[PDB]
A = this chain, B = another copy of it.
Amino acid sequence: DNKINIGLAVMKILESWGADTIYGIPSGTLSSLMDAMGEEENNVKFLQVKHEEVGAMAAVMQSKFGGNLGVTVGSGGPGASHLINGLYDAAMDNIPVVAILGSRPQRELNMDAFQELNQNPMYDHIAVYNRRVAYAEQLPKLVDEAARMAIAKRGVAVLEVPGDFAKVEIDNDQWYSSANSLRKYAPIAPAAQDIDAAVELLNNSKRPVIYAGIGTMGHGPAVQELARKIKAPVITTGKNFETFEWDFEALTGSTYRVGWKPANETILEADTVLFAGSNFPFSEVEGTFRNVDNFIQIDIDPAMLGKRHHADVAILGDAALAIDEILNKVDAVEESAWWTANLKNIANWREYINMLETKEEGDLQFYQVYNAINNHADEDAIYSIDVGNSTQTSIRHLHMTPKNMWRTSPLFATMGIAIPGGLGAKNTYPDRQVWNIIGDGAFSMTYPDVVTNVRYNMPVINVVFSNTEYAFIKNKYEDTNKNLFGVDFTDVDYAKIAEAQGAKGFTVSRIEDMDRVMAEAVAANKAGHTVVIDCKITQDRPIPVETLKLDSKLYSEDEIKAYKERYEAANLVPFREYLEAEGLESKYIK
């Protein structure tokens, strides 16, 4: 032993924590650190992006997709501030990530020098750790603790690092990594008393429903078995569709806007809700559970117990173990009018969606684009979804199973999350098929980074929806506003831009050309090319399932007529009809 460069010590620490990829853009305030990358057999790699926000989002999405702890860097000042959308997303999603903010050298601090400023206030509100390194020798210790904190506190750990520190040398015995001491709690078994109370309520309920969030990830088969055992339909969240087999007989979808018709009707007619591993944000403001009688909640976070609705039964512990315990103790239900009515309601919805997806000719709609994806995607495909209307509606069409991964920016909802997500995913799974589904608005905030996929040979399939408008925003102008719309722009040739970036571009605007174009796009991706499919679609909006104008006791004939005509929903049948057909009555309608 002898001496070691502080920058190298930092890289050794990062590698010990599994943080082998740093995302960002090189700069003078970060050079000393980056210069240590590699050599001494270090395995930390640098992935250079075009905009630091994409680097931050990529580092975060890497973890969302099950990858290693990500690290993102931003040069002192503007580079650091550019990380904001990625860090806010991580903070709200409780995703570990280490953000390193470069800074002018120590001697320049507080001198009002060029691009010199106090960056401590920048992320203090959202960070789980936020410190300005005070002297070179403690940099290794703080990077180690930043990783430890990001992981333990499930959030953003931020370090402001003066650019001269990494150049300093220290004794090899003056630093260490605590990665070897990394420990995590194994799934914890729920209290028998709480499981028992839940079992009693479920046994005595006439209309049970399972509302499963990502806390049930990895336990879809068990949840489906419980659903079948007690004849309780399943409602999922916008983040948890992959947990279920897309064609599961009792899957009603999700509630509210980015949801399905069945789920939205089921929740208003349910009696007992098993809220498993969810923190559904629309709960209170949209009155999701306004008609429920009993509410059972399962969660590993005590801060969540009884948060979204009063909980008659609270179960603290792992959702897997809890579901298994409930499954073993609850009584089996052979026949149920409630179950039968729900199955028919779901089937009716699937008929509608299938009809839209399988059209043969005409102006392209996003429905058929999703159909093409289903017909050509690998069974274990990864989906990086952006936040627009046409992209979030993907959960109504993608035929996913737990073999897939579907991730977005679900709560903070930052636009432009797709491309960075694709980078994080492909970096983690180089041999796996990765799709980025993006709307024109979101694409326009991040398409310069398509070149990043090209440069690093991380081939992804970019599916871009171009409608010259904004469906999502076109939905918030007919529910609170009164004046005319106004969200129509020009016609940018994204395929041409892709070609200019070294990617392969395709343009499609007809349903009859979609299958061929998708096949060619997939084949090109398999040849190692990043592709951009510019889908010139119509201005059609996904049917608003939060405002179902189908029940003749809730809306007028004219309203139902116009609703059916606009969304091609002539064959959709209101849930009450299915309930009454099985001898039941609506608990709230009339």
CB under 8 Å from chain B, chain A span 138-161: 138, 141-142, 145, 148-149, 151-153
Q: A51-B445, A111-B285, A490-B502 are in contact. Are A35 and B131 (CB under 8 A)?
A: no
Question: Are B26's CB and A487's CB within 8 A?
Answer: yes
Smallest distance from the beta carbon of A103 to chain B beta carbons, Å?
Answer: 10
One of B133, B282, B445 near A50 (C-beta < 8 A): B445
Rounded to whole angstroms, the CA-CA distance of A497 and B50 in the bound complex is: 16
CB under 8 Å from chain B, chain A span 95-111: 106-111
Mark interface residues in A176-195 (1 if CB within 8 Å of B CB, else 0). Answer: 10101111110010010010
Q: Which residues of B contact A116 (CB under 8 A)?
A: 281
- Cβ of A582 within 8 Å of any chain B Cβ, yes or no, is no
Smallest distance from the beta carbon of A291 to chain B beta carbons, Å?
Answer: 13
Mark interface residues in A213-252 (1 if CB within 8 Å of B CB, else 0). Answer: 0000000000000000000000000000000000000000
Smallest distance from the beta carbon of A116 to chain B beta carbons, Å?
Answer: 8
Question: Are B480's CB and A163's CB within 8 A?
Answer: yes
- Cβ of A428 within 8 Å of any chain B Cβ, yes or no, is no
Rounded to whole angstroms, the CA-CA distance of A182 and B122 in the bound complex is: 33
Q: Which residues of B contact A48 (CB under 8 A)?
A: 489
One of B32, B153, B310 near A176 (C-beta < 8 A): B310
Question: Are A455's CB and B490's CB within 8 A?
Answer: yes
Rounded to whole angstroms, the CA-CA distance of A306 and B183 in the bound complex is: 11
Rounded to whole angstroms, the CA-CA distance of A164 and B115 in the bound complex is: 28
One of B117, B141, B480 near A31 (C-beta < 8 A): B480
The segment out of A204-212, A338-346, A469-477, A540-548 that lies at the interface is A469-477
Question: Are B302's CB and A152's CB within 8 A?
Answer: yes
- Cβ of A201 within 8 Å of any chain B Cβ, yes or no, is no
- Cβ of A527 within 8 Å of any chain B Cβ, yes or no, is no
Among A35, A454, A472, find the residue whose CB has the most chain B CB atoms closer than 10 A: A35
Q: Which residues of B contact A513 (CB under 8 A)?
A: none
Question: Are A306's CB and B152's CB within 8 A?
Answer: no
The segment out of A76-84, A265-273, A371-379, A517-525 that lies at the interface is A76-84
Q: A307-B145, A447-B448 are in contact. Are A28 and B412 (CB under 8 A)?
A: no
Q: A305-B181, A451-B490, A483-B35 are in contact. Are A120 and B121 (CB under 8 A)?
A: yes
Question: Are A482's CB and B35's CB within 8 A?
Answer: yes
CB under 8 Å from chain B, chain A span 44-91: 48, 50-51, 77-78, 81-82, 84-85, 88
One of B184, B279, B284, B303 near A148 (C-beta < 8 A): B303
Rounded to whole angstroms, the CA-CA distance of A168 and B50 in the bound complex is: 43
Rounded to whole angstroms, the CA-CA distance of A496 and B499 in the bound complex is: 9
One of B31, B85, B500 near A481 (C-beta < 8 A): B31
Q: Which residues of B contact A92 (CB under 8 A)?
A: 117
Question: Are A78's CB and B31's CB within 8 A?
Answer: no
Q: A181-B314, A305-B178, A480-B164 are in contact. Are A115 and B413 (CB under 8 A)?
A: yes
Q: Which residues of B contact A303 (CB under 8 A)?
A: 148-149, 152-153
Question: Are B500's CB and A115's CB within 8 A?
Answer: no
Q: For the complex, count residues of A whose C-beta is within 8 A of B.
A: 121
Residue of B whose beta carbon sits closest to that of A116: B281
Rounded to whole angstroms, the CA-CA distance of A314 and B28 in the bound complex is: 36
Smallest distance from the beta carbon of A164 to chain B beta carbons, Å?
Answer: 7
Question: Are B497's CB and A78's CB within 8 A?
Answer: no
Q: Which residues of B contact A297 (CB under 8 A)?
A: 181
One of B28, B131, B133, B281 near A476 (C-beta < 8 A): B28
Q: Which residues of B contact A164 (CB under 8 A)?
A: 480
One of B107, B118, B315, B486 near A131 (C-beta < 8 A): B118
One of B26, B50, B181 near A486 (C-beta < 8 A): B26
Question: Are B302's CB and A35's CB within 8 A?
Answer: no
Rounded to whole angstroms, the CA-CA distance of A487 and B81 in the bound complex is: 22
- Cβ of A588 within 8 Å of any chain B Cβ, yes or no, is no
**Other contacts beyond A28-B480, A115-B411: 6, CB < 8 A:** A27-B476, A163-B480, A178-B310, A181-B311, A492-B502, A497-B497
A residues with a Cβ closer than 8 A to B are 25-28, 31-32, 35-36, 39, 48, 50-51, 77-78, 81-82, 84-85, 88, 92, 106-118, 120-122, 124-125, 130-135, 138, 141-142, 145, 148-149, 151-153, 163-164, 167, 176, 178, 180-185, 188, 191, 194, 279, 281-282, 284-285, 297, 301-303, 305-307, 310-311, 314-316, 409, 411-415, 441, 444-445, 447-448, 451, 454-455, 470, 472-473, 475-477, 480-483, 486-487, 489-490, 492-494, 496-497, 499-502
The 9 A-B residue pairs whose C-beta atoms are closest, nearest first, are A178-B306, A28-B476, A181-B314, A181-B306, A183-B316, A78-B414, A152-B303, A121-B125, A496-B500
